[PDB]
Each structure stands twice: as C-alpha cells, then as structure tokens.
Design a protein around this ligand. Sequence first.
Ligand code: IXM
Ligand code: IXM
Lengths: 343, 339
Amino acid sequence: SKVTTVVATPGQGPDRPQEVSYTDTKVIGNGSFGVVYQAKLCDSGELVAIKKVLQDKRFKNRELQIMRKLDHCNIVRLRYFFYSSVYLNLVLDYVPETVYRVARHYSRAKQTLPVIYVKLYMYQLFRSLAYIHSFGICHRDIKPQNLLLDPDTAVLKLCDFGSAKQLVRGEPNVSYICSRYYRAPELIFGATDYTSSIDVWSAGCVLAELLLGQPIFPGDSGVDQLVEIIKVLGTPTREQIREMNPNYTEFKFPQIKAHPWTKVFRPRTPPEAIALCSRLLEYTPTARLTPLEACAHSFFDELRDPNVKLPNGRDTPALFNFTTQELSSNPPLATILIPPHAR
Amino acid sequence: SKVTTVVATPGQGPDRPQEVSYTDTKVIGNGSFGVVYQAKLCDSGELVAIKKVLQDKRFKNRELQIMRKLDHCNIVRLRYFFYSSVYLNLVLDYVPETVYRVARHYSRAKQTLPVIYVKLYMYQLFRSLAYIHSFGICHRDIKPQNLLLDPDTAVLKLCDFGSAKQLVRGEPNVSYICSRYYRAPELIFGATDYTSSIDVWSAGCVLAELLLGQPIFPGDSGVDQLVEIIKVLGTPTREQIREMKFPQIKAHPWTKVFRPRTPPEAIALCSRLLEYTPTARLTPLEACAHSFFDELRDPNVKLPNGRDTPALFNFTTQELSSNPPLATILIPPHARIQA
Ligand SMILES: O=C1Nc2ccccc2/C1=C1/Nc2ccccc2/C1=N\O
Ligand SMILES: O=C1Nc2ccccc2/C1=C1/Nc2ccccc2/C1=N\O
C-alpha cells in the first residue's frame, strides 16, 4: 500500500528529527480543529494517531507547545510532529475507544457501566488533571469524547489539548470554551477570572453521567442548563453567585431548594459515588475537591485493594506510580494514594 | 371524559372574569421553563395550548406581562390566564406544527423545503420581530422550535416569550440566553450590552438552515461555533470584534455554501443578516422589504395547495414606526386598491 515517509521531530528530548515511515491511513475523528487519522508505523508495526491542523506559520501552535512538555501514563503521548502541505501533524498514541462510545453502548443496551469501570476511568482522569494542574495548565474541554480508553487494559488517556491554557492569576480568559453540558456555572455566567477548578466541575459531570446513563445537566441554552443545575443544587445564594462571577449581571431565578442528591441516582448507586459527586459539583469553585483529593476519595478505595482485578481477569493498570510533581499540591495525600502493598 | 372549569382573566380586554371549561389534555411540549399542553374547549370544541409554569410570589411573571400587551397576527395570542395548584397557566392559540418538525421531516427524507415556503415563513417571522422590536422588546430565543406553523394556511406564529425582555440602553443583560446554534457572535463573546439585533442573527440562522437542510453554525462549544462562523464570514477584523486567537481564514463565497440553483436573492439576504457588526445587520422591516420576498408581493401569487397567501400587507403605524418610508415597498400597489 501507499507508504509515506517524512522527517519528523521527536515529541520529547532534544530537537533532533528522524526519518519516519507510515502506512494504512484512515480517518477516525473530525471536529472544527481538523482531522485525526490512524496510521501504522512501518518500523514497529505500531498503530498511531495523526492529528492534522492548518498552521499559520507566523505563530507557535499552543497545543504542540503544551504537548511537548507532558509526560504522564494517563495522557496521550506526543510521539512526533512534522509539517506538510501548511499543516502541523501531531503523531500521537492511538487508543481504540472513548468513554463517549462505551457509555453509549451501555446506554442503548439499557445497561449501566459496571461501577468498577466508573471507578477506574474516573480515578485515571483525576490523576491526569492533578498532573496538568500542577503545571498551572487547565484543559478547558473535559468531556466523554476526549477520554480515550483501552477496552482490554482499562487504561484511560486524556486527549485533545486544543483548548488547553496555562491560567495565570489576574489574567483574563475567554468564557466560551468547554462543551455544552460540561461547563461550570461560572463559565455559563460569563466569568473571565475562572481557575482550573472548571475541569473539576466537568469531571463531576462525566461521573454523574456514567452513573445516570445520560447527561446530568442538559439544555440548549445557558438558561436551560442553569435550571437543571438549580433543580439539583438548589438556588445559588447571593454569595455563591459572587464567587462564580464577580461581575454578574443579575437574572431572576425561581428559588428552589436543594434536591436530595441521593434522590438523583438509581437506588442501587453506591453512596460513596453520590458523596463524591456532591463534592465535585459545588457552586463555589474553591469549595470543590482538587483532582488529588478526588483520587484519595473513598469512592476509589476498591482500586487500592491488593486483590482487585479487572472483570476480564487481567490486573488493573498502574495506579500508584505517583511522582513528586504529581503530588506537589498536597504531599501528605501520598499516605492514602500509595497503598501499603504497592510499589 | 374529565372536564375542567376555571375562572380566568381575559388576555387583554377589561378585567371581566370568564368561566372556561376544557378537556382532552395532553403534553405537546416540555422544557426547563414549564410544560405546554394542548386542550379542547368544551363549548366550541376548539383546540388551545396551555403553558403552565411555577409562579413565584416575589415577582409578577415577565412572560405574562409582555404577552398581555401584544396583539399581532404572527404572534400566538394570550386568550386567558389563571392560577392553580402555585402555577400560572397561560391559555394560548394552538398551532399544529413547528418549523423544527417540518424541517426535520424534509431533512431526514433528503429534501429541502420548497422555496416558496421559506419565503412565506421567514417573511412572517420578520414581521413578528418588527412588531415586538418597535416596543423595544427582544425575544432572545429565536429558533425553529419556537416558530409555529399551520400546514394548510401557511401562517407562522412566533411563540414562547419566556426569555423576552425590554432592552434599555445602558442597562446590562445576561449573555447566557438563546439556544446554541442560533446565538449571535456577540453573545458567544459574552457581551451584556447587546441589542435586539441578536434576534435578527437568529432569524438569519433559521433561514440558512431551511435553505441548507441542516444548522449552518453547529458546534458543542462556543469555540467550535465561532470556527464554523469564521469559515463562512471570514476572520473578524479587530474593529468588528470591538463592536461585538482564531486561525485567520478568509471570506467564504456564500455561493459555495448552498446547493446549486439556490436563489441568489436568498444568499444575499443571508449575508445581510449574518454580519459580525450588529448595527450592520438589516432591521426586521428592512428584511421584509428585501428582494428575496418580491414574489410574495406579486398580485397573482398562490400557495401550492391553490389557496391564497395569508394576509401579508396589513401593516400598522406601530409596525412601520422604525422606518415609515418602507411602506412604499412593503404595501404593493394592488394592496392599495380602493374598496
Ligand atoms: O487514538 C487516538 N489518539 C488521539 C490523539 C488526539 C486526538 C484524538 C485521538 C484518538 C482517537 N481514538 C479514537 C477511537 C475511537 C473513536 C474516536 C477516536 C479518537 N479521536 O476521535
Ligand atoms: O400550538 C402551540 N401554542 C403554543 C403557545 C406557547 C408555546 C408553545 C405552543 C404550541 C405548540 N404547538 C405545537 C405543535 C406541534 C409540536 C409542538 C408544539 C408546541 N409547542 O411545543
């Protein structure tokens, strides 16, 4: 078949390009950004994904700059990058499924994702967030379609850093990032001074969705979304509104009082799952758990049990190889995060 | 069959309570706002819609206050309102179809609505907007699901004033109103000083959608939406952004957007509605006067089913107030013939 050879620059290390050959190209994803292809490396026979985007030569691609610095087991790895035509081509790890597709399979089969997988996937997402956040980097587009999954190993990898940005105190950021159902209230209210905790709200929406079988805060307009949020969290206090967006414009919302979180999910739902959701989906941004505190939550204790296994009989992926960087926001959590048996 | 009798206040006359009895109730629409039912009046056997929403005792319902003052052939009429349980119930005209349902029928059959209907529906939507805007009222949620249609008469009625508000110069307004695909760029950018022209952008999105067979500016995030907009309008100039980090793609020949044989006037109207600079967009009245609607002003025009078109020229002074001289185009010669 058609073999393409290019001279590409390695994602990490010194800037020393090498000839790379690949074949068996085919589309696997789209979006406004550009196209994602699957390809096979002639050398190793390995499958990789190539994300191709139009690049204005007069400026540095921000996604590329962020990817060159990331190195984590729960984030898709940038293997190489090269230019063609002008297009920037990001050669990344290929993962065969997404949380989006898997949840949809269960959904239209009238089944819910077994909790052991909800635990595994969410724990790995929080690890990836603790890592990028320790560098001040906010993903800003956490949603099921951006959570890659390997069906057999149960490994999850965060992808698509096209909206990612280092958030700096006092510097304004656009409020129009983040996909519909996963946007934190402060973004809906138009704040430009938000923090990385908007990713935590997004992660809480994904957890709730996996437990429920459908999005927890749907709506075609910001108003409709806020109504679904109010039905569950109750009406925001004047103080809470202040904390979300210092410059709120003022709207009249029907004063509704908190709907018992336990009344939200089906009866069999683990109580720890519900408590974690309530600590993630909070109006006050600073009141939400940090990613690391989420990883340490009791909902994930089963993952720390010495004898846990995947339903397919294999062992769980690596869950405890935390680095100092990863733990930097709160070192003492290591006593919970790294169980007695792990190494 | 269960019959409900309530004592209700008339939509607009003097406050003379009336006894209203209805039956055969069923949900025809839902939403975060409140449920809309269809019901049958016992006496005349006529169908009506009942929109029921929770009513706080802190404020009087804004949709209710706005609808008590509206009277127009292209806006659904508030007949009565009454409270129950506390719920506010608005009794309104019933229309059997929506642009949303009609467009979906054609779309999933790989066809587009015949252009004569695009003309009729869009013209009537622009008339309804010229009317509410002449009172400074902005709908703020123009979308296919809020455009009611009568299949046989081709009459269109604007509905759902749950987001509507009188916009006053210098007063801030929330930027989180309006549905996803139909939001003006300035709302996506978070402006709180927008004008009624956000309804015009929304109307342009509906026209483009009816011509195309699918939404013209889809996207799950504001960023994705802006990229689809830029692909068509080109990159906003610094000045345009002011009036309201993306790749500098240029101006896309709107002609490349629609299928071959799409009327050139349809394309020109779309380009004058979907403009970055809000003040640069046509006003509703100017849109009605656009050449894309000339066929509706032809003395011999008929609906495909053979019936005559609905009333299109009975403009009032209020309706024309934003630009009286347009009447020389809006009211065709044959519509001025003496009785
Ligand atoms: O394996 C992958 N590596 C990536 C790196 C960056 C962006 C996407 C991907 C990607 C993807 N893998 C998929 C498997 C099934 C359906 C969609 C995708 C996808 N993308 O839609
Ligand atoms: O006939 C109507 N009068 C209304 C007044 C206010 C709000 C809605 C309506 C309304 C509606 N008519 C419909 C016909 C088919 C599907 C949905 C609707 C609907 N609404 O979804």
